[PDB]
Symmetry: C3
Amino acid sequence: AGAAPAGGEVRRVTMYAERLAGGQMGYGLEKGKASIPGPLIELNEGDTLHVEFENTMDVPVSLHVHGLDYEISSDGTKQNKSHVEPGGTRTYTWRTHEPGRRADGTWRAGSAGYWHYHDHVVGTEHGTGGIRNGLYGPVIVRRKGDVLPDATHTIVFNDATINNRPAHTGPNFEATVGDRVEIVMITHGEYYHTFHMHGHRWADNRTGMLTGPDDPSQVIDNKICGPADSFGFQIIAGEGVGAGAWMYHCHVQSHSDMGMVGLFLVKKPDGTIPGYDP
Amino acid sequence: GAAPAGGEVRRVTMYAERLAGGQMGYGLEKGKASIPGPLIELNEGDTLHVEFENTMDVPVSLHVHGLDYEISSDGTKQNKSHVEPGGTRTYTWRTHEPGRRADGTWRAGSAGYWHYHDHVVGTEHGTGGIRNGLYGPVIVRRKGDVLPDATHTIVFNDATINNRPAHTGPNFEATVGDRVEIVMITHGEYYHTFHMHGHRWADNRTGMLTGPDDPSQVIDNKICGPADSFGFQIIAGEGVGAGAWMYHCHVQSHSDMGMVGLFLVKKPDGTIPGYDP
Amino acid sequence: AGAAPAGGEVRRVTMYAERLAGGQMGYGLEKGKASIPGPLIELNEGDTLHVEFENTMDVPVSLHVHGLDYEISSDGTKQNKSHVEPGGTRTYTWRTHEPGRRADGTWRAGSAGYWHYHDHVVGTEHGTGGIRNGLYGPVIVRRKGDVLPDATHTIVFNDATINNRPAHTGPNFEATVGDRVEIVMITHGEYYHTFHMHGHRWADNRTGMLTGPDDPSQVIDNKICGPADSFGFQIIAGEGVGAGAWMYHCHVQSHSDMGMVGLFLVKKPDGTIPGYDP
Ligand SMILES: [Cu+2]
Ligand SMILES: [Cu+2]
Ligand SMILES: [Cu+2]
Ligand SMILES: [Cu+2]
Ligand SMILES: [Cu+2]
Ligand SMILES: [Cu+2]
Ligand SMILES: [Cu+2]
Ligand SMILES: [Cu+2]
Ligand SMILES: [Cu+2]
Ligand SMILES: [Cu+2]
Ligand code: NA
């Protein structure tokens, strides 16, 4: 696979907050193309991102990001008046940094990780309405040399839904046996959850992959998460287990019974999935 | 002692059976089902063929966490890998050692504290079967892992421990200095926090720090949710001595309602100072 | 910055349990000086601490500690008769130890970490009433060479309150940009929470700081916690982000909405906070 390069680029992108059907709200990079979850933003440590933001809605909205470097003017809260008025525009700036030794000998942690952005002002001063309506999305910051995946899928447990979809409607994600598949897992709202994936497992650390034989991180296939938690991992699709419709679901029993389930559809090279009859 | 390299093909018979009071359990022999079900121990590289029989009048399945299995041993109705009433099926579990892939990455091995449970009784996620007692622990050891003097399994199933009536333990006994392994599994609807008085462990794969370079937090209290599993080994009474050492869920209403038990640590002469039930 | 020395001192302190206003109860080091959270106790690995304890209330109380070494006679439970009757006195003894290789060849974990003490007998035999009333406090055990902070702040999520405070009353904590600030985070009661801090992040490990480039711990700014969980970390105030009123809060949406929120007030050297009014 590929490997992430050293960062240091200054990038710019447009983002819009838009109303969607059914009282929903989403972010998008192009006007009229908002989505829930919002678009995946990927940066290498050291990169700067200027987000030229426009609120197309009739209510104030904001952009608050986890983990990355931002000044108080990009906090995205009413507290420091860094929200965006209806119809207004604003440049949010996110920075990231590499890890390194401070002059005093301590080690500064870098920005790399699985992160997310979301609204902080719709409905309440903590964005309860905006988050419920769909204003959230994933952010990945990569360290130089991190392994790059063939595909990235984002799964958000928001209240009792996955990605604000109606119960029992996935999402499903497709891969071929051997694909290096990255999962970004974000939780929002009111409830705790446990994320479980059949047939696969990952390391409970920054990258979801063990660094080598000396990494003592627990290897897991089930993880408890609460509102605004984010983690991610990579798996080799079907590794040691073969093709199939591999369930993922919240493992809180009533949540899985009510439709917080989806399928990791791992196909053979001929594109078929043994035993899978929809 | 230490765990050997795995690679054996092992076989075991397992039965799902009704127990008293609407409960259900797994067992290795007919009539000896238990809650939790039997402890299954493997070394990385071992294969296990579970020759499974459903003795009940409703369908049941066997779904395992962590281990390698093909979709035909998923243990779900969706993949048609459940067991009809009176039926039999061989579930196959495989395990593997860690190793460097061709692309240069490190493949994580199977070693860890895992568990198996039903996936079809009551609902297509086994909500009824899990509630009824259809769960059990699996340990997969890596070559060189330290072996314990005893292993005890503690399952927080909804507001119960091991499906026992409230305020009824279970209790476990050890002597000061014993190396005691705890397997901790959670099931059902609720989050919990597992706490043990007088003892502590490392929040990592084995529950023990690998040495002075391991940065894992050392804890005596751990949040867990449905289908979480973890485990650890402690030295009974290490630095604290003999006594009736409580363990309990630390969610206050849960400990109040009876999610509590005792780790009875005896001196070599058998005495437990001040213990008076 | 400073570094913790090797421990091994026999230390002594008096502690009192007292009623406070409005049905609350607290621990203090001197009579009339009980606080919620109770006083911060700091030890170096190897130190022994003798707590000369006195119950000044009209109901039995106890003192139970997490993480530290104690004999069964200092368990602090009525079950073992290590509670304190009204007006009674008792000496609770806590010990700590350095890590080291056992005779059996395995590595014995040291006492170092972020811990806490609390009541175990008020209301119920698990201290539900006493904890609810305010009988809890932080304990920090440092390892030789641990980095010492400029200030330490304790944040306890107790049911749906912070430090038993009325909703929407903080607490707030002040620092200057560049300060090395230590946060002790304890959870009590009935609910799970997720602790989030704007503008800052830490490592999910013992110290909250990565040991160096080989530490694979996830770097986070959001962490799920349940009753009797404790963790801590150090941050450099405003590092890479600047001065400002930086929010911290539980991220469970109804909890933040109903006032489990405070401010990390990071000042410029002149003492001002950009974008914030008192
Ligand atoms: Cu916030
Ligand atoms: Cu859920
Ligand atoms: Cu599973
Ligand atoms: Cu947030
Ligand atoms: Cu499942
Ligand atoms: Cu519980
Ligand atoms: Cu499961
Ligand atoms: Cu207790
Ligand atoms: Cu909360
Ligand atoms: Cu406690
Ligand atoms: Na870890």
